[PDB]
């Protein structure tokens, strides 16, 4: 009864995948991830919520002649990681930061088979970069940068109009983290949030404004 998985071309070699979940209070929430094509290899930037939609996504690309080389999950929540177990079962390399894999284990979830540490990580040299801005939406949240098309996948860190689910947030750190991201990716042409429409570098400033207001709200009784 949920909207079908969507796959829409965003730019040369870049697709947005949109999967849907009902979230109590938030309604029917779209989740955007990317598929990035390097040569004839496909990289999932976040998995759909479900194994079934992860399989539909993979099959769509494989039928068109792309080889699934890996997934990277931007944070531990199921809107980024729901398909890791299914990918693992198909011997598709899954990636997450050491911190994301720690928070997956803490949450009783299947871990990524491959991990990385530190602040900047090249999943694919000169094509797909992982950057940790610091804690915000979650302690582990990372962004994914595509240097060639100047596309930033913000995941659930980019929150231009409201912060959404604060359950795992570090509201004290989020402003400092958003200042760092804003300083690093002003050159972004496209910024792709998890749960709202694609925009431009202005989404980094709007996110900073929301983080500052969230921290203020957290200090009220
Ligand atoms: C709107 C929304 O729905 C869900 C299911 C999430 S998350 N990434 O916290 O699970 C959020 C969010 O704030 O990212
Ligand atoms: Na794997
Ligand atoms: Zn989340
Ligand atoms: Zn989310």
Residue numbers in the entry: 3 to 223
How is this structure described in the published paper?
Lineweaver-Burk plots demonstrated that SFC behaved as a competitive inhibitor with a submicromole-level Ki value for IMP-1 (0.22 μM) and micromole-level Ki values for NDM-1 and VIM-2 (9.82 μM and 2.81 μM, respectively). We carried out X-ray crystallographic analyses of IMP-1–SFC complexes. The overall structure of IMP-1–SFC complexes is shown in Fig. 3A; one SFC molecule was found to bind to the active site, scaffolding two zinc ions (Zn1 and Zn2). The sulfamoyl and carboxylate groups of SFC were clearly assigned with respect to the electron density observed. The details of the mode of binding of SFC to IMP-1 are revealed in an enlarged image, wherein the nitrogen atoms of the sulfamoyl group can be seen to located nearly equidistantly and to be coordinated with Zn1 and Zn2 (2.0 Å), which is where the hydroxyl anion for a nucleophilic attack was originally located in the native IMP-1 structure. Asp120 forms hydrogen bonds with the sulfamoyl group of SFC (2.8 Å), and the carbonyl oxygen of the sulfamoyl group is also hydrogen bonded to the nitrogen atom of the Asn233 side chain (2.9 Å). The spatial position of the Asn233 side chain shifted toward the zinc ions after the introduction of SFC. The carboxylate oxygen O1 of SFC coordinates with Zn2 (2.1 Å), and O2 interacts with the amide of Asn233 (2.9 Å) in the protein backbone and amino group of Lys224 (3.0 Å), which are conserved across B1 MBLs. Additionally, the methyl group (C6) at the 2-position of SFC is stacked in the cavity between Trp64 and His263, and this methyl moiety is likely stabilized via CH/π interactions through Trp64 and His263.
Production of metallo-β-lactamases (MBLs), which hydrolyze carbapenems, is a cause of carbapenem resistance in Enterobacteriaceae. The genes encoding MBLs, including IMP, NDM, and VIM types, have become widely prevalent via bacterium-specific transferable genetic apparatuses such as plasmids. We report here that sulfamoyl heteroarylcarboxylic acids (SHCs) can competitively inhibit the globally spreading and clinically relevant MBLs (i.e., IMP-, NDM-, and VIM-type MBLs) at nanomolar to micromolar orders of magnitude. X-ray crystallographic analyses revealed the inhibition mode of SHCs against MBLs; the sulfamoyl group of SHCs coordinated to two zinc ions, and the carboxylate group coordinated to one zinc ion and bound to positively charged amino acids Lys224/Arg228 conserved in MBLs.
